[PDB]
């Protein structure tokens, strides 16, 4: 395929700050003829439509703000934003229109920082109500924390255990900035029943050592 | 000015058929090639089909024999007609218009139309009410199992209690849909107050609550 990669995926930012998104081609866009690049940047923001930004690399779409400046030839391009508004906050794709099939980098998006923050971590054994029904999940919730990147592992009996976890990641919190995740091990009651200690263990680089939670059947 | 408007999306089961419509207005769309893009739930946008001013087609691999693109000049239409629907066919489809006269450069795209493609059956959620175990602050929860399609709605209190709330994206397993929300309050709080998870499902037609129970040995 004529394929785009797009470094990073995410990008922690400051308001006001200049940014620089990056898009690599696995074969050149630049077209001989007419020395132009066959390369655009699109803007999608939450529950909307790509809207085209950039194209031919560095030409700005009418009514797309100054700040936004593409470049780059070749293999190699780059979207820079002077000045980073809130409403930047969002994904950006690039594509390629050199060749059919026309493709599409997988975006990178831009997110606030804020400041390291701690995970609360909480463990729900199974509901009484779940377990008539001969079913058993575990809830771990790990709220609040800050930077993104976190790591669950559930371990039983002081064993770990992988198939029939279900994680869920929350998106950047709009008022604290922070991120939340919910993980669930769904287990049959039968297998529940045969162990004593579930712990959700979270790692995070707020701490040198996991933070775990646990109950005993 | 230039308006572009999706339709005819919606749930079917694997192999099934659809057509898409894409209404255009505010300018010449003779002028124009069209295209569709669709969106996964991977958020990855994948280009589907483009139709030139002239009727020339062109096909994505995947749907190349499965989906037909086409146009009506003289009502302003595009549509995309997909037969034997694969689960990977799971995405929003925007219809695009051409930026110029002369290529098919996503210059102008619709909101989208959603297309699920599943075989899983209308399943309400078991709705399992999430109570602390063994302070100042105390986190309760409301796990959502198992439904089918999205979306479900959840409320703690009916509205009341908003913040110290996070409900989490739901996630697929096994073609059904898990949702789980935690609401976080004073330890004065609750269970002094009682707290009570709501959860509507308006394709199952259920809507049920949850008390949140505090644990504790009224045990036998």
């Known amino acids: 395929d004529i394929v785009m990669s797009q470094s990073p995926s995410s990008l922690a930012v400051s308001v006001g700050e200049k940014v620089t998104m990056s898009c690599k081609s696995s074969?050149?866009?630049?077209?001989?003829?007419?020395?132009?690049?066959?390369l655009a940047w699109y803007q999608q923001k939450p529950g909307q439509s790509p809207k085209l930004l950039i194209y031919?690399?560095?030409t700005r779409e009418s009514g797309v703000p100054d700040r936004f400046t593409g470049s780059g030839s070749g293999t190699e391009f780059t979207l820079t934003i002077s000045s980073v508004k809130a409403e930047d906050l969002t994904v950006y794709y690039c594509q390629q229109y050199y060749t059919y099939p026309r493709t599409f980098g997988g975006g990178t998006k831009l997110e606030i920082k804020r400041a390291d923050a701690a995970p609360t971590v909480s463990i729900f054994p199974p509901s009484s109500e779940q377990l008539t029904s001969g079913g058993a999940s575990v809830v771990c919730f790990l709220n609040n924390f800050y930077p993104k990147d976190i790591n669950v592992k559930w371990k039983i009996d002081g064993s770990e255990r992988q198939n029939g976890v279900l994680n869920s990641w929350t998106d950047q919190d709009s008022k604290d900035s922070t991120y939340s995740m919910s993980s669930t091990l769904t287990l049959t009651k039968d297998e529940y029943e045969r162990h004593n200690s579930y712990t959700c263990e979270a790692t995070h680089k707020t701490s040198t050592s996991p933070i775990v939670k646990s109950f005993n059947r | 000015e230039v308006q572009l408007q999706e339709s005819g999306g919606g749930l079917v089961k694997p192999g099934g058929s659809l057509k898409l419509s894409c209404a255009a207005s505010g300018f010449t769309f003779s002028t124009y090639a069209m295209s569709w893009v669709r969106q996964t739930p991977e958020k990855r946008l994948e280009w589907v089909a483009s139709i030139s001013t002239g009727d020339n087609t062109y096909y994505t691999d995947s749907v190349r024999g499965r989906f037909t693109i086409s146009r009506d000049n003289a009502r302003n239409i595009l549509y995309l007609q997909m037969s034997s629907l694969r689960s990977e066919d799971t995405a929003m489809y925007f219809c695009?218009?051409?930026?110029?006269?002369?290529?098919?450069?996503?210059?102008?795209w619709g909101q989208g139309t959603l297309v699920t493609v599943s075989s899983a059956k209308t399943t309400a959620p078991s709705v399992y009410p999430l109570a602390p175990v063994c302070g100042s602050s105390v986190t309760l929860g409301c796990l959502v199992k198992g439904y089918f399609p999205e979306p479900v709605t959840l409320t703690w209190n009916s509205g009341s209690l908003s913040s110290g709330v996070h409900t989490f994206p739901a996630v697929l397993q096994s073609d059904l849909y898990t949702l789980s929300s935690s609401v976080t309050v004073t330890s004065s709080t609750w269970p002094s107050q009682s707290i009570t998870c709501n959860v509507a499902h308006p394709a199952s037609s259920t809507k049920v609550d949850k008390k949140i129970e505090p644990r504790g040995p009224t045990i036998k």
């Open positions: 695009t218009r051409g930026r110029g006269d002369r290529g098919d450069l996503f210059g102008y």
């Open positions: 074969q050149s866009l630049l077209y001989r003829g007419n020395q132009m690049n066959y």
């Open positions: 031919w690399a560095s």
